[model samples]
Target: SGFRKMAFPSGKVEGCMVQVTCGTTTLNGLWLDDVVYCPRHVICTSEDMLNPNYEDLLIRKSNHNFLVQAGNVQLRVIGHSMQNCVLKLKVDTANPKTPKYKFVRIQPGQTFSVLACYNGSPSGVYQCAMRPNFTIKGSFLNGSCGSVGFNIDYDCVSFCYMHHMELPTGVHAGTDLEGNFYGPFVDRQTAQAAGTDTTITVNVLAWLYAAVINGDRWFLNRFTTTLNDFNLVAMKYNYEPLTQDHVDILGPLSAQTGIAVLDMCASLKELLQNGMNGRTILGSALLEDEFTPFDVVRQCS
Candidate 1:
């Protein structure tokens, strides 16, 4: 009876052959679905230069030029290894069960983009994450998402922090969109030439406020670049070039003191423009008014 039982083979179980025999040899077989499944998961470095070490994954947010809409977020998963991989994306939301996900495949040196609606309200922050792990049967596995594809998370807080202002403010009348300045006008000469003095003044203030709050170099560089442009044009027109050192100082001090540069500039600008209201200028166009160096006022007061 033991011999008979041992010799008997499981030819077909669950529509698959579990055992087979050939010339007195009893061979064991596993169903195709029963094979262990795992995807590769590699971590990526930075967005621009991803997977420098043959690591399979990196996440990067595209600039606004690629953004589809106001509530829409766009990011890309880059693959650097030799093999193709699958990635699963997760979005954090209050209703976890109602959250959204997307699966993408990435090849070596290729990128898979994830674009979707972002949640907002007086609502909590939302962050999107990617990982190689997936569920199999009733259990979750640490499988590789793949050799070159996986996921990473980018938070809305940093997103909001980086893009404080949707667009830069200052623009001269004769210039087209490309020449629009992303900084405050240091001198009114170009604005006067373009016949957009009041417009330039208000928008320049708004631009400066946005750049100060963001505290990111991209915005600061734009600010300085615009100032340089203004200087070049103003000099040709016989007006003074706006001083850049004041703005340079504002950046570090704002970072150190946690006070909005808007307030600091406003306070100083008010003292220079008006006699000083509460020693602060909440918001008023100081374009035509006399101005003093912010540092001198800070030292004297």
Candidate 2:
């Protein structure tokens, strides 16, 4: 067998047309006269692809407030930095494009939050592009919009990634900033515009807050731990009555006042064992109704 070697002039191979001959007839692999590419146009593999981008998750509708609830079903925003940093939620939602999404610049060991709520609603999906030297990951959270901010002290790449909610293709939301509340249902191809553009996300953050919804009253564990789970203390939410066997903090009108009960499983078990009836489990009502009937309970017991 015989082999042949070829070389190029500029070091980088502009073209690699090959000619092969078995006996007389010669065959060529490819033929090219010129090749043109800019410095930024380097051929990159999928693994080599880097850099991610970001955008602000905004809501346009004022009535559409952030309903901070329990369960992983809620939506949320997060930020990470190449080095160390903090991102603050800008209280204002006027300009969607003002804060250019990028890696946070911070010193080593220092940390900060880079995510926030745009604080309003059309509540849908938007674009989230990658930064120049990074890849992004994200998804739409129903209770909240998903966004990432970072503090990058060293060289860094930042961007949005993944999407829990799908962007309505072709259908648009008019403009990038207007989708959170208004209607257009447009599709954005960029990462930032797509990732941060949302209103009513799919409630991915709910599991964290949600408790076992039993029969009558549910529990807001955060309310028990501290007053910070929500505006519970400031709002003065009432608890419902507990059984002699168990304490009932069941509030007949607590929910109407924007209060949610916590610690449901323990409360329900106690109430049930004591033969105390009338009290209902809040969150588990749906589940119980769907899976358990009076007959089913009687049969099981």
Candidate 3:
């Protein structure tokens, strides 16, 4: 960025300082600002939970191949966006006139991920800036002697980081504060005091799925005409979550995370005779009144 002409209506040339605004341009041809947000906040709270932004999630999980002319003036570099990549930016200059532009700059070899704030799962909307100086940039110099591409091959991967392979934070247990403990449910109460009773149906289905996991699909369905408490649904996903393995039919990764694993104290007791209420979700413990939308066995950190 160079060459600028300043003209005025016969105004004083030294009354104050001249101000210049930098035009918005892609860094090395990569959209770093799309994700490396400001001072803090990786995923903004206002983001659409169903369809969250992944561009910013590209930082460490992706790669951008760029041909640059580093260490020079007027040289150039460039790359293109194709999906999946990482971001890393830094500044170490001792100039006073260089104004720090307000934009995101992901440091080299940096990582950007969804923060676990809401409902205790990574579903929490937080700043990738969780790491110091990783998602933000300060006074930096552009177009070095060999520097420039402002070309990028942002080939990246976008995903959230989790801690527990089992359900801990993301779950639609019941409804209000005690029931809603996971991602989607964390926001479900946004309606009435008790909120829309949508997860209830899911809970029932989860209990069924749990019975299925127990290798008792027959005896489990035995309750079909017994209690008359059966609650079926139109869309399978409407009542239960689809795993990533089903993405082919589940479609895009839009509405996701958290789950409705019902409290089956009643069902569990009915399952066994003299033993404790024994149950499992694909070999894992009971939903424990909470969960995620994934394969029964898919484990994570």
Candidate 4:
């Protein structure tokens, strides 16, 4: 008589079953949500191409253009294999208990964007990051976030690292929304065929400094992409800095890489300002003016 202990089923499991049997969107009795809640977790990939360089870069291909925002880079998770899958996306903020950004549900057509920012106060030491950090969760069974989507485009405009800037600098040397010469020219020259009272000369170095600190969602997106990589000794294949060199490599610039880049501007502005105070400040000596791209500078720190 002591043998009677049985249970019906879990309400959650019941919902899972009901959804599968009665709903039109279930796959093998699994709702996108259920599949997303399965035991294991999965990450997907994409062929999706994203460029953080300024927009209207000549062609200015703006398809699904809104995928990312100014000062923001996006990492997408859409691959054919996971097109049928769905999941939840969250940022693994420095402080998880009270995340800085909201976590959301994503399927195969959205993206997780990070406000490309640097946090190293005193500014010049490289703390740039996708503010909240990020995470994707779902069954080892389902995932990714986009349609021919789920992808990312990195726009590394931070005036960090002296080396990322290599071209010569001059008054006529300028760029438009496309860095027309690996740069822009207050915009363009076609309109100036006639005459004008003032001319905007872009010093490659100074332009970028303004680019970031000035922060324009639209213009920044454009005047950016006018940059590069090269050589076996160069980034011809040199950087894995953030792992864009391999497969499905996604996410904001790798922690160190981005901040390193951010470091460029970090110290640049202040150091220049501080150093200027040293000499280039009052009398304007060459104190903080380490502004020399005619050659190149390198460092481990």
Candidate 5:
């Protein structure tokens, strides 16, 4: 039973048949959808130069100009090792991931390129790398929906801070645009104490009073007592009050601190007529022989 189990024809041993025919010789087969290889060792030195005719194994230089003059010739690379050990060719000294020519354990097969080496460095060392064919899945941009390239550049923005102006003023033309000097205008905390709301409208009479002192009279030549013009000037910089510096210069003439407050112009006639009754209205003092109309002066004031 043991002999039957052994089942060797002429009493051959385990190792005698090892060279020619071992035990049951079986073949293992494998299938892979996507097989990835991990890089083990990166070649850093040149070892094959000791062999015969190492120079002939170096990558051949191709003159691209000649190819263009005649016809397009595909560049070729040759390996250095004894045809048996050569593996791949790298592009430059950096030896990037993808190579152009990679030999799979073969010899005498001509590569499109040979390893290019350089020697006149600080000391001296040079070698070539064999790049291999690789299928790399990548992402790309399409012109659809306005997709462009993958890089970006930044642009700086221009900006300006808030400004302020007093009433009865006319800015020099072009003062509002980019070239004109505007202001380091102040927001008067003192005025905020006087008024509780953001939209603080001083009584027209009070405004005229401030005008007598703080507001610029030189501007009067450009605009008369037209109330609307005064209002537009006041709105320009949203100024809380004329600065003390400005007040020292022009406030005395404004007659503001001593003036009485008044309401909106419900009727220009009533307003000017009210002034005729010894009121300290904006423009005309209560003097005789001014020859002014009621409604027009009222509205104009």
Candidate 6:
């Protein structure tokens, strides 16, 4: 057997072409005579993608308000009205060359959401308008046009991460900010390998909170030793502890607020549990994991 070695210049090899030959054997790869590369990426909001005369095209129907939601890189169009219409939406990110366009037909009160690949890119701007080529009855007001906001602040990554309510891809067991060891194992795989619980202690508290919110004293009694799990995790992250006053307010407020807090708690619970068991939660079996960090912080605050 014989081996041959070849070295190439130091530069990006991605999409480059190359060819190698050894006697009767030959291999080829991407090659380029002159490489020209430009890097482009920017984060903007739907309002930033609007046309200059967006106001002139704005829809003023009392029931027609086009709303947008983002998660991870996913973007969604939420329409309000009773008329059937076509919505033309445009998305622009930091990459100037690649823009996305989505056309959706909304009937009355319907929503269309798609996974917009933010993939660690900045949240770009997006705008919505009625297609000038088509006509839908009452889609826009007589003289009113329609569009979303400009440069609206949003988290494209966290939105999809939490919106799907799926468990994290992997969990590396480690110390909190205080260097206090947490979790039942060193990482998600090792915990699974050892058949140990994989849920982190931070989320253990979330489970407790969910039980308390559900009025399940039986479950809450399991952690009667200390309720400061919330405080411990919060302190590690430099957030104020959930004081007794906060607890009192949350108890009554959650009951009246229709479970937004509870939903977050439930989502966190499922994430931790999913991590522990290496499984995803779905169905009426558990709450959808759409609880974003914003939801968690807002619930606590």
lDDT string, candidate 5, 26-92, tens digits: 1110001111110001111244212333234333322221111001222222221112211122111
Write candidate 1's Cα lDDT for 48-157 as tens digits.
12224323223332122111111232222121112222112221222212212232322111111111111111111121111111101111111211111112223110
The residue-by-residue lDDT of candidate 2 on 210-287, one tens digit each, is 222212223322323232332232222222222222112223222323344343333322333353244333323221
Candidate 2 or 3, higher TM-score?
A: 3
lDDT of each: 0.24, 0.22, 0.23, 0.19, 0.20, 0.24
- lDDT order, best first, reads 6, 1, 3, 2, 5, 4
Give the range where candidate 1 is weakest over 10 consecutive residues by summed lDDT. 156-165
Q: What's the C-alpha lDDT at position 176 in model 1?
A: 10
TM-scores of all candidate predictions against the true structure: 0.16, 0.16, 0.23, 0.14, 0.13, 0.20
TM-score for candidate 3 = 0.23
- lDDT by residue (tens digit), candidate 3, 33-128: 222111111212344333435455333231222222112322221222322122222212222332222213332222232222211111122222
Choose the strongest candidate by lDDT: 6
Q: Candidate 4 residues 1-301, lDDT tens each? A: 1111121112222221111111111211111221211100112112111321222221332222212111132322121111112222221111112211111222211222211111100111111111111111111111111101011223212111000111112111111111111122122212222122111111123223322333312212111111132112112221212222211211122232332232332333343334434332212343211211211111111
Please name the candidate that would achieve the greatest TM-score relative to the true structure.
3
Worst 10 residues of 2 by lDDT: 199-208
Residues 1-301 of candidate 6 have per-residue lDDT tens digits of 1111111111222112122221232222111222111100011123423322222333432211222222223222232211111122222222222222222222111111211112111222221111111111111211111111111123211110001001122221112111122223221111132122222222223333434443433221112213455445434533334445444444544564344443433344334334424332211243222222222333442
lDDT of 3: 0.23
Q: What TM-score does prediction 1 earn?
A: 0.16
Give candidate 2's TM-score. 0.16
Off by over 4 Å in 1: 1-51, 54-301
